[PDB]
Amino acid sequence: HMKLHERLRELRSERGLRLKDVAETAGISVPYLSDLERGRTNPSLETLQTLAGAYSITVHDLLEGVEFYGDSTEGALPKGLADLVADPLLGSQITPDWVRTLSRIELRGKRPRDKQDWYEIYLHLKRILG
Amino acid sequence: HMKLHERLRELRSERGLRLKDVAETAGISVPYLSDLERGRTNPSLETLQTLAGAYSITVHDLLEGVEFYGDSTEGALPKGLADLVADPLLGSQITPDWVRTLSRIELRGKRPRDKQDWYEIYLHLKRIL
Ligand SMILES: [Li+]
Ligand SMILES: [Li+]
Ligand SMILES: [Li+]
Ligand SMILES: [Li+]
Ligand SMILES: [Li+]
Secondary structure (H helix, E strand, O other), rough: OOHHHHHHHHHHHHHOOOOOHHHHHHHOHHHHHHHHOOOOOOOOEEEEEEHHHHHOOOOHHHOOOOOOOOOOOOOOOHHHHHHHHHHOOOOOOHHHHHHHHHHHHHEEEEEOOOHHHHHHHHHHHHHHHH | OOOOHHHHHHEEEEEEEEOOHHHHHHHOOOHHHHHHHOOOOOHHHHHHHHHHHOOOOOOOOOOOOOOOOOOOOOOOOOOOHHHHHOOOOOHHHHHHHHHHHHHOEEEOOOOOOOOOHHHHHHHHHHOOO
């Protein structure tokens, strides 16, 4: 179920549903569904809502466990700073302006990689500045 | 409880980034990113994973807490039976043929609607067999 098309057939397969059942429910043809399940074509977001509705799950729950492969895009923020922002428990009090300030920090193409490290930088910087 | 374009706006807004920071990194134009955040147009899956990469999160995590209003499709299975199959802890060993057998059961156009009820039906039916 790691690939999206593999997950789609898994949902149908584990429920023991025939292609026509899912297709008639989703208002789409068996050949189109079959193409989606084989990965020949890529579903649109609207198609995912309908497929997820057929399986009585949310799109977010449908995409659970799905790896999208594809090309890789470098993150806008450093991973440690991004993870800190992503973590609700740690760095929640950090204002958006501070995230921008921290983002500019970088050393010689080398940056500290721990979310905890970025939190300490913020605390020390916030004490000195602001 | 949140719309997709609202979530995209929130991600950039909480990080304090500018459209151009995300856009140049994402490899998409500032106007297109603006349209995505406004809700004017819908991103493809390929574009969505690019945005997720810009925010250093998974597509699954990006869509956490996002609500889609578009669909009205009914479920292929009963809600209770579907919840049972969806739950990994409950009825993990239930075979697909058993799911199909169970799906045919309905009474007077009504069903129990509870995952626990479906599991108990399965346990007893399996025991008779
Ligand atoms: Li499917
Ligand atoms: Li068909
Ligand atoms: Li769409
Ligand atoms: Li959904
Ligand atoms: Li992803």
